[PDB]
Structure formats: C-alpha cells, structure tokens
C-alpha cells in the first residue's frame, strides 16, 4: 500500500496513470428509434395502475 496522492502530505506529484479512452467516443451511428403510434386514439387502455 502507499501514501495515495492527496490522502497524503502535499508533494504535488508530476506523473500519473491517467486512464483514457482509446479513441474518440462520439463518432456517428446516432441511435434512432422508429415510432408507431396507436391507430385509434379511442381504444387506448389507459386504465390500470
């Protein structure tokens, strides 16, 4: 076990293990859902709960 920068002294250390994303994360292929609307707006349960 070790100090733990922060939970220990103050020696600002200058080198860490930063974990990062391997490559851009927001590249195209934006989700897209198809929508079907009820076809009667008069036979729409609504009841229960």
């Amino acid at each position: 076990q070790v100090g733990i920068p922060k939970l220990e002294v103050d020696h600002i250390s200058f080198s860490n293990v930063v974990s990062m994303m391997t490559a851009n994360i927001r590249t195209g292929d934006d989700m897209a859902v198809e929508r079907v609307n009820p076809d009667d707006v008069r036979a729409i349960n609504i009841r229960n709960a």
Binding site: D39, D40, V41, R42
Partner: protein
C-alpha cells in the same frame, strides 16, 4: 353453356346509386355515414360497410 360461377348479388338494378349504395365489390357500402372518428387515412371502411 359456359357460365362459371353463379353468385346471388343483391340486384344492383334495384339498389340504384340513388340510394348512394356502391354495390360492386360484393357487399353494400354507402359512403359517408356511420364513420369512425380519430383514425388514419384508411380505417374508414371496415365499417363504411
């Protein structure tokens, strides 16, 4: 000596289109009458009948 099928329509000559009845397809079928409300473009036929 050839006839094929012999249905029993509903005498088109009596139920003339002076009774707004378009009778070809087989069944009666007046146009605007007990139409349903709140439905897509079609749907106005299950009961146009």
């Amino acid at each position: 000596y050839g006839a094929a099928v012999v249905n029993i329509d509903l005498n088109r000559d009596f139920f003339d289109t002076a009774t707004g009845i378009d009778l070809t397809k087989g069944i009666p079928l007046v146009q605007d009458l007990l139409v349903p409300i709140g439905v897509t473009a079609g749907a106005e036929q299950s009961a146009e009948y």
